[PDB]
């Protein structure tokens, strides 16, 4: 079986209602097609066309206005021919689909609202109902998510993302969300945006 | 000649499909055999006709039921998949098991409509 293809998504792996994913499969192996599948559905979600050139060949499937059926993971194969038997699957991409539940998370800076430049900074996702799991996402740096297990503290279910002593590249835009137990895939509405700004070495929140 | 006009018709639709769809002569004869009706009008009949005698849904791949790989799929190898392949899945065009049926009746409902187009004024002339 041929070597499988590459699956990546943009913008994100986290996606809101009514709005379309782009995924896209490529190759170094000379596919002329490419088939998408979803969590062991016996039917595929679409198979898609696209000429080598040199081998290097991508499709770029579209997923439609996205619900909560479109939470879970996905592979995709590629194929030389239309007779031709398919690749190894990619290796697996996870879509979350957020705006699923009423409760609301809320994202903080653990240590204050601004910290020092020897101090670290500790990003502290919470929320007052009970969560299995939060997730922490920054902006443009769309890449899979930070997820950790929530505790119950302080009559809450928060988890705190530990980023280290005060750096450049803790600025940026944050979001968090929460995901239940038996849905992993569906997650809350994000957070509220917390904007990091590097001021004299230490990092401020921004609004 | 409203006998010559039906058989026409009918001969018509036929030939458009065959062209279309690249779908031998034998197949051909396959539709006539189910749309001598007065159903050569309807791209639903015709679409449904098409899909059972040639196998359209062993065209695209399909996944074993107890667990399994994907794999091409059994009639991969008959024209009518490489005629739907060519019509359907170009660079950049994409399809699933509930578009191709509006596809192929998009088109066959275009070959109703200029068969019938053509031979009336023919005539009328
Ligand atoms: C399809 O690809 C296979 C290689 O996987 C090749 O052996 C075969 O000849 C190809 N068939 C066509 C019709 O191009
Ligand atoms: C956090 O900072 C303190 C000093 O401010 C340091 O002792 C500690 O090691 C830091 N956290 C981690 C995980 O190292
Ligand atoms: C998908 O997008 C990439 C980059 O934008 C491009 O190289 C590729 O040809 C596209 N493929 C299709 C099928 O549009």
Redesign the interface.
């Known amino acids: 079986?041929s070597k499988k293809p590459s699956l990546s998504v943009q913008p994100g792996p986290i996606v809101a209602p009514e709005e379309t994913l782009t995924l896209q499969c490529g190759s170094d192996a000379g596919y002329?097609?490419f088939?998408l599948?979803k969590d062991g559905?016996?039917?595929?979600?679409?198979?898609?066309?696209?000429?080598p050139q040199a081998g290097l060949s991508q499709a770029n499937?579209?997923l439609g206005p996205v619900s909560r059926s479109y939470g879970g993971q996905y592979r995709c194969?590629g194929?030389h021919n239309?007779?031709?038997?398919?690749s190894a699957?990619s290796d697996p991409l996870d879509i979350l689909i957020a705006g699923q539940f009423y409760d609301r998370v809320s994202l903080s800076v653990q240590p204050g609202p601004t910290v020092a430049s020897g101090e670290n900074v500790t990003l502290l996702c919470q929320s007052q109902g009970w969560m299995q799991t939060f997730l922490l996402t920054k902006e443009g740096a769309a890449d899979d998510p930070w997820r950790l297990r929530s505790t119950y503290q302080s009559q809450k279910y928060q988890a705190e993302f530990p980023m280290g002593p005060v750096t450049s590249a803790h600025a940026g835009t944050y979001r968090c969300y929460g995901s239940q137990s038996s849905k992993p895939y569906l997650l809350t509405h994000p957070s509220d945006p917390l904007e990091l700004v590097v001021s004299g070495g230490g990092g401020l929140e921004v609004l | 000649g409203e006998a010559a006009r039906i058989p026409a018709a009918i001969d018509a639709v036929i030939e458009g499909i065959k062209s279309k769809f690249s779908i031998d002569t034998l197949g051909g004869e396959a539709l006539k055999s189910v749309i001598d009706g007065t159903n050569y009008y309807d791209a639903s009949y015709i679409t449904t006709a098409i899909y059972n005698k040639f196998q359209v849904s062993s065209?695209?791949?399909?996944?074993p039921?107890l667990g399994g790989?994907?794999?091409?799929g059994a009639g991969?190898?008959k024209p009518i998949?490489?005629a739907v392949?060519k019509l359907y899945?170009?660079?950049?065009?994409?399809?699933?098991?509930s578009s191709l049926p509006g596809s192929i009746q998009k088109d066959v409902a275009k070959i109703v409509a200029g068969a019938e187009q053509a031979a009336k004024a023919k005539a009328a002339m």
Do not use: H, I, M
């Not at chain 1, 239309?82 to 398919?86: A, F, H």
């Not at chain 2, 899945?89 to 098991?97: E, I, Q, R, T, Y």
């Open positions: 079986v002329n097609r088939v599948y559905e016996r039917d595929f979600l679409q198979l898609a066309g696209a000429q499937f579209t194969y194929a239309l007779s031709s038997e398919w699957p | 065209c695209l791949p399909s996944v039921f790989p994907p794999v091409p991969a190898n998949c490489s392949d899945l170009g660079s950049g065009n994409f399809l699933d098991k």
